[PDB]
Amino acid sequence: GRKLFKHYINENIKSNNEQKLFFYRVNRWRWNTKDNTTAPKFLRLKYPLLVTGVCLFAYDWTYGFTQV
Amino acid sequence: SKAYYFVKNFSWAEVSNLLCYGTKYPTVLNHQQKVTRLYRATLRRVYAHQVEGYKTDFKQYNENITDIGKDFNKMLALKPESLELQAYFKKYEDLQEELFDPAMIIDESRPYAASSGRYYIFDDY
Amino acid sequence: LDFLNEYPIILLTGLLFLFTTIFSLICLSYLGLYGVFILNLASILLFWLSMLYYFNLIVSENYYYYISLGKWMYLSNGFRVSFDLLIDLTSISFSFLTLTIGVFVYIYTFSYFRYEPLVERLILFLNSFMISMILLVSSGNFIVLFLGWELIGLTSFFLINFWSTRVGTLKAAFKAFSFNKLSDLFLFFAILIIFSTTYNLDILSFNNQIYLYESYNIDMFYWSINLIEIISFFFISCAFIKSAQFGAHIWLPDSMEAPVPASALIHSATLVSAGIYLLLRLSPLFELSKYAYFILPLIGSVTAFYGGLVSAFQSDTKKTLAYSTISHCGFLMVSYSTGVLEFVILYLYVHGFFKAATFLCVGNVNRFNRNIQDFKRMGGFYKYLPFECLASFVCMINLSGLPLTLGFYIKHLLFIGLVESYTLYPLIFSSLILGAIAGVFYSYRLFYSIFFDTKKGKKAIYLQASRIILNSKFYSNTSLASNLSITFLVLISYTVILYLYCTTLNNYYSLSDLKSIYINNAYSYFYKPDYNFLNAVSILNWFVIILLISVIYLNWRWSYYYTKSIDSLSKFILFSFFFFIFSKYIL
Amino acid sequence: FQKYPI
Amino acid sequence: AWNENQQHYKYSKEEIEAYQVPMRIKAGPCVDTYIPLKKCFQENPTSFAAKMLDGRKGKCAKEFKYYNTCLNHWQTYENNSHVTNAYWADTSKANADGISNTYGGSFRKGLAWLN
Amino acid sequence: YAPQKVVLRNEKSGYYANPDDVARRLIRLISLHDKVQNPSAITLKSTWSEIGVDPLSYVEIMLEAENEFYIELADEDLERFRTVEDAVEFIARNFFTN
Amino acid sequence: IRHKFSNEITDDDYDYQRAMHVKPPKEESLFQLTNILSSVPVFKTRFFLDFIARNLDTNSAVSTSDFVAPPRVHENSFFVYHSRELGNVIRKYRSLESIVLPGALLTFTYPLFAAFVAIPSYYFMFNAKIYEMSRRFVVRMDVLPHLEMISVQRIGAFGILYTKLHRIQDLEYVPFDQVKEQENYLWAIGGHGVDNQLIFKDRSTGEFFYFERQGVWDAKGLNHPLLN
Amino acid sequence: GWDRPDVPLSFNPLYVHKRELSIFDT
Amino acid sequence: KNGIRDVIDSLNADAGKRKLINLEAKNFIERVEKECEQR
Amino acid sequence: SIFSRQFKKAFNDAKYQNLTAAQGETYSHLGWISNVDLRLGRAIFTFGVVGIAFCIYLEPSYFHETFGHMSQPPKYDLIDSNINGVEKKLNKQILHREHNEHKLDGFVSMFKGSDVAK
Amino acid sequence: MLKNKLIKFKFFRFVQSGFYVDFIFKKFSEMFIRNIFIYSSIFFGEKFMI
Amino acid sequence: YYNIMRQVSLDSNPIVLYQSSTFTGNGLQEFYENADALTKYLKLVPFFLEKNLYDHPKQFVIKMEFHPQNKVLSLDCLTHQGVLKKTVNLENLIPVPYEDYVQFCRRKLFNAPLFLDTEMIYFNTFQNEFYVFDKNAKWNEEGINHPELDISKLYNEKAWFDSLRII
Ligand SMILES: CCCCCCCCCCCCCCCCCC(=O)OC[C@H](COP(=O)([O-])OCC[N+](C)(C)C)OC(=O)CCCCCCCCCCCCCCCCC
Ligand SMILES: Nc1ncnc2c1ncn2[C@@H]1O[C@H](COP(=O)(O)OP(=O)(O)O)[C@@H](O)[C@H]1O
């Protein structure tokens, strides 16, 4: 009768079950996926890159001839 | 609760007593009062460090508060003269000291808060 | 028009600004909130327009003015001093920055303190402080300089301790008051020594005859001290107290309970720059001083390292900005120790503009969070303050000195001209390197924790700011005027910094004379750099890259994306290697 | 702040 | 003759004062090439953006060539760039040739750059 | 505009928050707890022991109560609460309650 | 109450925010990939369909059940534990050493600069982040009953797989309280994937055994009498 | 929402001086 | 003979050293030309 | 039923709901973003990105110092095709010698001109 | 390096407090104020010397 | 908490619960022949691209059957390579809102087509993978009202409200 790979899994399961749901119930609004996102998904770089392309094309056809 | 921890010439022992218990003199409190006040202070500190923190982990916070609740439930049923209860008091006072922040967030509703008493209110006289 | 070039209107517009401020202070019952706002806005806009017109003439062309208002006071038997103003490159460099930041802070200050009972008092105090600083930098003699020095200390004592009903803020104001009294003592003793030596108080004359007294000594009770050494010692002491160098910095973090427009003015240019101005005002004296040569780089580097590392650990937004300001003041001291006076001006302008903009964004965030300035109780603010998020991103990437930004160049220029002949050079260089890399840490911490973390704040903020009845075209968590102020401030900052970069860093040198005859070979490594120097700067570049990787890919918490985060890091490393191979060798 | 009589 | 302008004219001290050449340029050997460039820019005013974005310097392209030559020579002689770069590449060959025994004696390349 | 005449302070009902709203939110939060058996027996006159709230669960609930009401309560004030009514009145009479 | 005013914002005006805000789809724009591939017949042709249907993945590599029986490492052995995704990621990260390191050695102008930068980077952040956890990671665990041992398959340098045998009687559980202090950096930045409450060790040799949190456990193997 | 009363005078609590002010703490 | 004088002396010595390096490089290029012209 | 549409939608709405609010007030998310603030922020962010792109395209010395020197896209005049044959070959040789002599002259003049302007 | 005392809260609060420089400087200033000003100036000077 | 594997079998009388109207065919060739099926398949290409390149573990379901004795759901999944058959234990299925499915992937997703069911997305905790259906579909009313599919036996507050949390 050893204590390998099943005894301690059962103990961990019991420890997890012994947690109180009350705190969970008062913090569910914090993890709302409707109200939070990551930085790269909010700072979209498509239209700024279009403006960048337009500006660089204007530079190339205005002052780009005189390089070096 | 008045947050005058640092604006009075207090020693660390007085500040530690005020942080762990709502008074400078915890010897005038009942056993239940002391246990409940220490539990409230510990939960407040753990929330201030593991929910409103830097890189907060909710799972770890739940584990720690469950363990603290078990320990304090054991603490409540003990006797005041027992040495095990004294060891528990020492352990959780050490926990309060170890998480002490010189830059505590003070709620704006407390008497000695950062934005308290900003306006002079005129009475009927 | 030639009449404008021959007779400046800066004096007229500045007098209009000053008199409107004073009369609004005295006749505040006739002018309501709107009256004070409108009158002072008109005066400040006229002043800004006139100074903007003259900025180009003074900076590019060799225009400067010496104005005398009249004989003022008798200071010796048969001696009288006059009220003199010197509008030259050194003065205009500080005054234009102060006036522009002040104009935009003035427009922002009405949206801030939106329904407070004492908006007029704050507006007038900010105007008084700006006027005092502009008078200080435009000094023509030492007496006007002392008057401005005492005025900036007094008016900053009232912006601090604005909440005069609290003794807690009174203590914080009194700390700065005591430090300012020490500064005044040091400055006035230095002026007394100068007057006892040369018997004049005119700055220009002082800058041209002080070299004749290099081999002079003064007799203290048991000591024979070189004159230049003692004068430079006192000037450097007062400058150190005002610029909040290490040790004498403790008054500055305690100055943060002032309203955020006052912090934006005080910490970006104005007060913290005052000491730097002194170093720029009396350059020959410190060129001929051994004490300056030893003390400027060492103290500057120590201050830079200390402020940079302390800033990266702060949780209060205002404390983070204050410690960043301390670090940048140290960097400015080192840049002056370089011996190139253009780099000092470039650093001053860049730091002042971007620090002021960051203060404005932080102030809006703090107002939203209901006077809680610690971002441990913030998070997920991007959807409630989107303009603040994006403008703050721009301002922090410029302020932190990240690669491919305007703030990168001032750091690079500082490291170009650093002198390696100091005895304590290892400590100085290590401190400078450690302080240079600290910007990324606090910039990332501030931005990510305020805007793109988990919701750590109170439920009331988020839930009250998101009710269905509030959905409208008028919905906003800030004011339109604040957004316009920040946008125009950023645009003007970019334009001015680009103009200055063209004037100083182009192949064709266009800047006006700086009235200094000490010339070194620092521009050579800017004009014709060699291989080892480029490798040395690449070392710091790669250190910054490693730190960025650390702040992006480190997992300090359990998450559902941990394994995918490691996978993405591996993918990025492999892709970078292959991209480098393709871009360098084949096609 | 909420307005109060003066 | 890298320090000489198109027509070999040496400007007088009064001319230097009148054309308000900065002290930074005055301390160098490129005043005689800087003054005509400043004059051409004076009768050909240009905005700072165009000055930044024009490699040829526009209408000032003739004088700017002389100024570039003078500035290159001035800065490279000021910081010994030619000797330093000659010693950086094939330091053994430079040591054998004895290009500059004053610099060669104390020269040490960093360990990270191929030992 | 102020009427330019002497106007005294108005105390109105003495509540800075809606007492019914405060009571409903507090009772919902109490019912969220694990050891509370039924939400339908909770009343303003109910004592914490009646609804099965031992002192440790009491401090647990009162911490989340101060989190939910945007205030913070002193130890003595919480010790003086005997029923739900006492806490409801104390919270509704607080100037900082949101 | 936006519907009560003639001039007011609408969802048509809010549609531009769908790039930064997640909402259910409303309509298809002309430039979307779905519309482009639905309209262009170059994608409807047989060549494109054949190219797509036989590239970029395969169905035989997709798990078709919630129960998996991996091939036996040895005859007479039975399966206990397997890892799913962290093992693959760790093996790819280790395999990076097989290509990036020789690539730097052959194509970098200054290879010593790369090593001089990699030494402190490894010793200060990367050793605790990935490498040590990968060394103590358990990729596969099986049991040999005739030998009464466990076979543990692990990942080495360059993505090398290797299997070692450990005696069952030498296995012992390591409570987290015994390791949280002298390895706090590893458990702070490089241990969030493995289970810190199920750490085992071989007392004979001192080797550790970490298991992936989102791994798979065999019900029959876990209840075997040899493992008790 | 709710008709809040005027700002309470408890916003500025009165100090009571429970202890003597020492001349050594002037 | 104290104070900033040591810094001034160091600056003068450094300027002399840089001029000497430039002169040595010029002499080297002259020697290379006269050596190659001989062949 | 787990697959019932009514219950599934109810759970979708209720997963992150606020349980201390009324029946119709349980939502805890912002359903929109401020139009004016977002537009102004997008404009200023676009300005910053355009500035970064100008810095990358016009002043690439950071990339030269950090990652080294990359290959350059081809750029040749192809103007010498006008002449053909032996003329073309001879002129190629002349231009090649001219380029090599120009580089040598640059190096040698750089080394000589130290004595000038002293 | 598998253990790091610099990621613990003690070092973190040490750095966040500005290396305790303000606390150290204020303690010495209090000693100066109390001793010099109160004791020496008012008590010594006025009561004994005056 | 721990992914213990339960060996299961297949029942001989499956109960059909979900039917896709536009994918009644049984192969890529049949889908290609049908015009509506071909159009839907081409519209689903960004879905497969997000599956492959962006590592978003979603799956697209055509048919669903219930095995009550073993409590196992049989799912017919449509990928770009072809049609797959999968078995899911009933204990490993939870409902998720649409925003969970979108936010699970860090990369921004392509604009989704209007035919995928945006209200009936189900997460597999053991496989950690999403399951989506068609808006134009046939749901068996008697099949889904089976007693073993009632939420009275399958509801679990922890597994449904806290098992999957997108930080
Ligand atoms: C003698 C030992 C040789 C083997 C050394 C093994 C350790 C280093 C192995 C390489 C790791 C990095 C591979 C990808 C490099 C991509 C960039 C590149 O090619 O730059 C060219 C340059 C090489 O170009 P170079 O050598 O021709 O010259 C560049 C100029 N100097 C050296 C003066 C800067 O790459 C490096 O400098 C890489 C070395 C420094 C970084 C070492 C790894 C740190 C940890 C990983 C960080 C992330 C790396 C990937 C992303 C980098 C860009 C954001
Ligand atoms: N005059 C004084 N002399 C010395 N110490 C004082 C004096 N006044 C206050 N203190 C210190 O400051 C603290 C003030 O606390 P106090 O405001 O009296 O709290 P409470 O009102 O709850 O009694 C006391 O604990 C005391 O130690």
DSSP string for E46-102: --HHHHHH-TT-GGGHHHHHHHHHHHHHHHHHHHTHHHHHHHHSSHHHHHHHTS-HH
| Catalytic site residue from F34, F54, F75, F77 | F54
Burial annotation L8-23 (CB, 10 A radius, 16+ → b, else e): beebeebbbbbbbebb
Which atom of ligand 2 is least distant from the CA of B24?
25
- DSSP line for I8-21: HHHHHHHHHHHHHH
Q: Which residues contact J99 (CB under 8 A, 6 or more apart)?
A: none
SS3 at position G98: helix
Rounded to an integer, what distance in angstroms lies between the CA atom of residue C296 and that of residue C233? Answer: 11
SS3 at position F23: helix
Rounded to an integer, what distance in angstroms lies between the CA atom of residue C514 and that of residue C93? Answer: 11
Q: Which residues contact L159 (CB under 8 A, 6 or more apart)?
A: L94, L125
Give the residue from C382, C397, C447 with the most A CB atoms within 10 Å of its CB, the best one to mutate.
C382
* Phi and psi, residue H17, nearest 5°: 60, 70
Could you tell me the CA-to-CA distances from E17 to C208, E23, F13 in Å, in that order? Answer: 18, 10, 83
Instruction: Determine contact, residues C566/G89, Cβ cutoff 8 Å.
Output: yes
Q: Would you list which residues of chain L are within 8 Å, Cβ to Cβ, of chain C?
A: 55, 104, 106, 164-167
Rounded to an integer, what distance in angstroms lies between the CA atom of residue A7 and that of residue A9? Answer: 6
Q: Which residues contact C135 (CB under 8 A, 6 or more apart)?
A: C144, C147, C148, C151
Both tokens of J100, joined, read 């090599």
The single residue listed with the structure tokens 């234009």 is C96
Instruction: Determine contact, residues C488/C418, Cβ cutoff 8 Å.
Output: no
Dist. CA C503 → ligand 1 center (Å): 36
Amino acid in position C507 = N
**Cα dihedral sign, F3-F6-F9-F11:** negative
Q: How near does any CA of chain D get to the CA of B78, in Å? A: 49
Chains F and G in direct contact, meaning 3 or more beta-carbon pairs closer than 8 angstroms: no
Both tokens of L45, joined, read 């290409």
For residue G11, with 0-12 CB atoms within 10 Å meaning exposed, 13-18 middle and 19 or more buried, which class applies? exposed
Instruction: Determine contact, residues C327/C306, Cβ cutoff 8 Å.
Output: yes
Is C580 a pocket residue for ligand 1 (Cβ < 6 Å)?
yes
Rounded to an integer, what distance in angstroms lies between the CA atom of residue L8 and that of residue G65? Answer: 9
> What is the gyration radius of the CA atoms in chain A, in angstroms?
29
Instruction: Determine contact, residues J20/F68, Cβ cutoff 8 Å.
Output: yes
- L161's enclosing H/E stretch is helix L157-161
C424 Cα distance to chain centroid? 27
Q: How near does any CA of chain E get to the CA of A62, in Å? A: 9
Rounded to an integer, what distance in angstroms lies between the CA atom of residue E56 and that of residue A63? Answer: 10
Rounded to an integer, what distance in angstroms lies between the CA atom of residue C126 and that of residue C101? Answer: 11
Q: What is the largest CA-CA distance in chain I?
A: 57
Q: Which chain L residue lies closest to A27 (C-alpha atoms)? A: L162
**Which residue CA neighbors atom 14 of ligand 2 most closely?**
B8
Provide the Cα torsion C293, C295, C301, C303; round to 10°: -150
Active site residue F77: no
Q: Which chain H residue lies closest to F7 (C-alpha atoms)? A: H6
Query: Which of C432, B73, C467 has its CA nearest to residue J25?
Result: C467
Burial annotation I2-37 (CB, 10 A radius, 16+ → b, else e): ebbeeeeeeeeeeeeebeebbebbbebbeeeeeeee
Beta partners for residue C225, in sequence order:
C218
- DSSP-derived letter for residue A31 is G
I neighbours by CB contacts (3+ pairs under 8 Å): C, E, J
Query: Which of C227, C319, C189 has its CA nearest to residue C267?
Result: C319
Contacts of the segment A11-14: beta carbons below 8 A, 24+ positions apart: A12/G197, A12/G198, A12/L1, A12/L2, A13/L1, A13/L2
> What is the gyration radius of the CA atoms in chain H, in angstroms?
17
For residue G75, with 0-12 CB atoms within 10 Å meaning exposed, 13-18 middle and 19 or more buried, which class applies? exposed
Contacts of the segment H15-23: beta carbons below 8 A, 24+ positions apart: none
Amino acid in position K20 = Y
Method: cryo-EM
Which of B8, B21, B25, B116 to mutate to test ligand 2, by most ligand atoms within 8 A of the CB atom? B8
Instruction: Determine contact, residues B44/B11, Cβ cutoff 8 Å.
Output: no
Rounded to an integer, what distance in angstroms lies between the CA atom of residue E85 and that of residue B22? Answer: 73
Count of CB pairs separated by less than 8 Å, J with L: 40
Rounded to an integer, what distance in angstroms lies between the CA atom of residue C450 and that of residue C391? Answer: 13
Which atom of ligand 1 is least distant from the CA of G112?
1
Instruction: Give yes or no for L154 touching J (CB within 8 A).
Output: yes
Instruction: Determine contact, residues B73/F56, Cβ cutoff 8 Å.
Output: yes
Is H17 a pocket residue for ligand 2 (Cβ < 6 Å)?
no
Both tokens of C379, joined, read 């998070």
Beta partners for residue G141, in sequence order:
G81, G152
Both tokens of C500, joined, read 């200055």
Chains B and J in direct contact, meaning 3 or more beta-carbon pairs closer than 8 angstroms: no
Instruction: Determine contact, residues C321/C291, Cβ cutoff 8 Å.
Output: no
Q: How near does any CA of chain F get to the CA of B62, in Å? A: 13
Is H19 a pocket residue for ligand 2 (Cβ < 6 Å)?
yes
Rounded to an integer, what distance in angstroms lies between the CA atom of residue C117 and that of residue D2? Answer: 10
SS3 at position L35: helix
Dist. CA B22 → ligand 2 center (Å): 15
- DSSP-derived letter for residue C374 is B
Q: Which residues contact C474 (CB under 8 A, 6 or more apart)?
A: none
Rounded to an integer, what distance in angstroms lies between the CA atom of residue C16 and that of residue C12? Answer: 6
Amino acid in position A66 = T
CA L23-L27-L33 angle, 5° bins: 70
Query: Which of C506, F32, K34 has its CA nearest to residue E64?
Result: C506
Could you tell me the CA-to-CA distances from J81 to F50, F65, J73, J78, J90 in Å, in that order? Answer: 104, 88, 21, 6, 13
Query: Which of C510, C523, C494, C517 has its CA nearest to residue C58?
Result: C510
Helix boundaries (H) for F4-80: 19-31, 55-68, 75-79
* Phi and psi, residue L86, nearest 5°: -130, 150
- Cβ count within 10 A of residue C427: 15
Is G118 a pocket residue for ligand 1 (Cβ < 6 Å)?
yes
Rounded to an integer, what distance in angstroms lies between the CA atom of residue C283 and that of residue C281? Answer: 6
Starting at the earlier edge strand, list the strands of the sheet with G199-202.
G171-174, G199-202, G208-209
The DSSP bridge pattern shows strands L72-78 and L59-67 to be antiparallel
Return the percent helix, strand and coil in chain E, to nearest 5: 60, 0, 40
Q: How near does any CA of chain J get to the CA of G197, in Å? A: 29
Amino acid in position C310 = V
CA C183-C186-C190 angle, 5° bins: 140
**Which residue CA neighbors atom 20 of ligand 2 most closely?**
H18
Dist. CA C226 → ligand 1 center (Å): 53
Instruction: Give yes or no for C458 touching F (CB within 8 A).
Output: yes
**Which residue CA neighbors atom 36 of ligand 1 most closely?**
G114
CA C324-C326-C332 angle, 5° bins: 105
Chain J hits for F25, CB-CB cut-off 8 Å, are 20-21
Dist. CA L55 → ligand 1 center (Å): 28
Is G96 a pocket residue for ligand 1 (Cβ < 6 Å)?
no
Helix boundaries (H) for C312-399: 317-338, 341-368, 386-399
Beta partners for residue H4, in sequence order:
none
Instruction: Determine contact, residues G67/L4, Cβ cutoff 8 Å.
Output: no
Check the annotation: does H4 bind a ligand: no
Ramachandran category for residue L122: left, alpha or beta (phi over 0 → left; psi -120 to 50 → alpha):
beta
Burial annotation L138-152 (CB, 10 A radius, 16+ → b, else e): ebbeebbeeeebeee
Is C585 a pocket residue for ligand 1 (Cβ < 6 Å)?
no
Contacts of the segment C174-177: beta carbons below 8 A, 24+ positions apart: C175/C250, C175/C251, C175/C254, C176/C251, C176/C254, C176/C255, C177/C153
E neighbours by CB contacts (3+ pairs under 8 Å): A, C, G, I, J
Amino acid in position A20 = K
Inter-chain contact C257–B119, Cβ cutoff 8 Å?
Answer: no
Chain E hits for G119, CB-CB cut-off 8 Å, are none
Q: Count of residues for chain A?
A: 68
Instruction: Determine contact, residues F68/F29, Cβ cutoff 8 Å.
Output: yes
Could you tell me the CA-to-CA distances from L93 to C112, C386, J17, L25 in Å, in that order? Answer: 51, 37, 21, 27
Is H18 a pocket residue for ligand 2 (Cβ < 6 Å)?
yes
Beta partners for residue C74, in sequence order:
C80
Is H9 a pocket residue for ligand 2 (Cβ < 6 Å)?
no
Dist. CA B107 → ligand 2 center (Å): 22
Beta partners for residue L61, in sequence order:
L77
- DSSP line for B78-101: S-TT-HHHHHHHHHHHHHHHHT--
Is G110 a pocket residue for ligand 1 (Cβ < 6 Å)?
yes
Chain C hits for E20, CB-CB cut-off 8 Å, are 62, 513
Beta partners for residue L64, in sequence order:
L18, L75
Beta partners for residue G164, in sequence order:
G152
Instruction: Determine contact, residues F27/B7, Cβ cutoff 8 Å.
Output: no
Q: Which residues contact F3 (CB under 8 A, 6 or more apart)?
A: none
Instruction: Give yes or no for E108 touching C (CB within 8 A).
Output: no
Q: Count of residues for chain H?
A: 26
Rounded to an integer, what distance in angstroms lies between the CA atom of residue C507 and that of residue E37? Answer: 12
- HSE-up of residue C141 (Cα within 13 Å, Cβ side): 19
E42 Cα distance to chain centroid? 22
Chain D hits for F2, CB-CB cut-off 8 Å, are 5-6
Instruction: Determine contact, residues F42/F84, Cβ cutoff 8 Å.
Output: yes
CA C194-C199-C201 angle, 5° bins: 65
